[PDB]
Amino acid sequence: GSVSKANVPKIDVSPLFGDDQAAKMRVAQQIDAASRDTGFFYAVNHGINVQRLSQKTKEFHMSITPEEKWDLAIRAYNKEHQDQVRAGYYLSIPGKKAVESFCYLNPNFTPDHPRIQAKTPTHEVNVWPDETKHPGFQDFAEQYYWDVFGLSSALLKGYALALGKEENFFARHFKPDDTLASVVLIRYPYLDPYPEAAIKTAADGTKLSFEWHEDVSLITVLYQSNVQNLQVETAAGYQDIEADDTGYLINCGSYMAHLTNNYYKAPIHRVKWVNAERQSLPFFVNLGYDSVIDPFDPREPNGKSDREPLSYGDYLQNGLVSLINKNGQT
Ligand SMILES: CC(C)[C@H](NC(=O)[C@H](CS)NC(=O)CCC[C@H](N)C(=O)O)S(=O)(=O)O
Numbered sequence: 001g002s003v004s005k006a007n008v009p010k011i012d013v014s015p016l017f018g019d020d021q022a023a024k025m026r027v028a029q030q031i032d033a034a035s036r037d038t039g040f041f042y043a044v045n046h047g048i049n050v051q052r053l054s055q056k057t058k059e060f061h062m063s064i065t066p067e068e069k070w071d072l073a074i075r076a077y078n079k080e081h082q083d084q085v086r087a088g089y090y091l092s093i094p095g096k097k098a099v100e101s102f103c104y105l106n107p108n109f110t111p112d113h114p115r116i117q118a119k120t121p122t123h124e125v126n127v128w129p130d131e132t133k134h135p136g137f138q139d140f141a142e143q144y145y146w147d148v149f150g151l152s153s154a155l156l157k158g159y160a161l162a163l164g165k166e167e168n169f170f171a172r173h174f175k176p177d178d179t180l181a182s183v184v185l186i187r188y189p190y191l192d193p194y195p196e197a198a199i200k201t202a203a204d205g206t207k208l209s210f211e212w213h214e215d216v217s218l219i220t221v222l223y224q225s226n227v228q229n230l231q232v233e234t235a236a237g238y239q240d241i242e243a244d245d246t247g248y249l250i251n252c253g254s255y256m257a258h259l260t261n262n263y264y265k266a267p268i269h270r271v272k273w274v275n276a277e278r279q280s281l282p283f284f285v286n287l288g289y290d291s292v293i294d295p296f297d298p299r300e301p302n303g304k305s306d307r308e309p310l311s312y313g314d315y316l317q318n319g320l321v322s323l324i325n326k327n328g329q330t
C-alpha cells in the first residue's frame with residue numbers, strides 16, 4: 001500500500017497578462033498538457049502577494065469569538081439567517097468537526113443589485129464582522145477578491161487558447177458585475193487529541209478530512225499553506241499532490257468537463273487527514289447566473305458535441321446542494 005506522487009507542473013502564467021501572443025500559446029500548451037494529465041498545475045509568477053493573504057487570514061480565524069461566529073453563521077448553523085445559504089461563517093464543532101471557514105461572494109452583490117432585488121438563488125449580500133473588532137479585514141478580503149479575479153481572468157485566457165478558441169471564450173462570461181465566484185477562508189486546526197469523529201476512512205484505508213469529489217466551478221484557483229494534504233485520483237489510484245505555498249493550485253471543475261465533452265476532465269480529488277494547523281483559500285471561478293457556454297468536442301474534426309448548453313446558475317445551485325448531500329455540511 002504505497003502512494004505515488006502526481007505530476008503537477010509549475011507553469012509561468014505571466015505571459016497571459018501581456019501582449020506576446022506566441023508566448024501565450026506556449027503557456028496555453030502547458031495548460032493543455034496538465035489538463036489532459038492529472039488535471040492539476042501550479043500557477044507561478046502570478047503577481048499576487050500571497051504572503052499578506054495568509055497573514056490576514058490567520059489573524060481573522062484566531063481572533064474571532066464564538067459570539068461573532070453565531071452572528072455571522074450561515075443558515076446551516078443559525079436558523080435566524082435564512083438568507084445565508086452560501087456566505088457567512090461555517091462553524092467547527094469541537095469533538096466532532098475540525099474544519100471551519102468563512103465564505104464571501106461578489107462584493108457588488110448589494111441591496112441595489114437586481115439579482116438581490118429579484119431574490120435570485122445563489123445571490124446573497126456578504127456578511128462581515130465588526131470593523132473595529134477586525135480592523136481592515138473586510139477591505140483586505142474585498143481587495144483579494146478582485147486580485148484573484150484578475151489572475152483567474154488571465155488563467156481563463158490560457159484555457160481558451162489551449163482549447164483552440166479565442167482568448168475571451170471563457171473570460172467574456174466572467175464579469176465583476178455578475179460573477180457568482182466565491183472565496184472561502186478555510187482553517188484546518190491542529191488538535192490534540194484529534195477527534196476521530198472528524199476523521200473519515202476511505203475505501204482504500206486512507207484517513208481523510210474531506211472525501212472524493214469534483215469541484216463545482218469552471219476552474220478553481222486555490223492557495224494553501226505548506227502542509228501536504230491533497231490527492232488526485234488516477235487510473236492507478238490516488239496520488240499525492242505536493243504542497244507549494246508560493247503558487248496557486250489550479251484545476252478544472254465539472255462545468256469545464258461538461259462543456260468540453262470531458263476533454264478537460266474535472267479531476268477527482270480528496271483531502272487527507274493531517275493533524276497540522278493550515279489554511280486553504282479557494283477561489284471558485286463561477287460565471288454569471290445566466291451564463292451559457294455552448295459545448296464542443298475538441299477530439300472531433302467538426303468539434304460538434306451533443307450536450308445541452310447548461311446555464312451556470314442552475315449548474316451552481318444543483319452542484320452545491322449535491323456536494324453537501326454527498327460529502328456533508330462543511
Ligand atoms: C471546507 C473544506 C471541507 C474544503 N471543502 C471544500 O471547499 C469543498 C470541496 S472544493 N467545496 C465546497 O464546500 C463548496 C463551497 C461553495 C461555497 N460555499 C460557495 O457558496 O461558493 S476542503 O476539504 O476541500 O479543503
Ligand SMILES: [Fe+3]
Binds near residue numbers: 213214215
Ligand atoms: Fe475541491
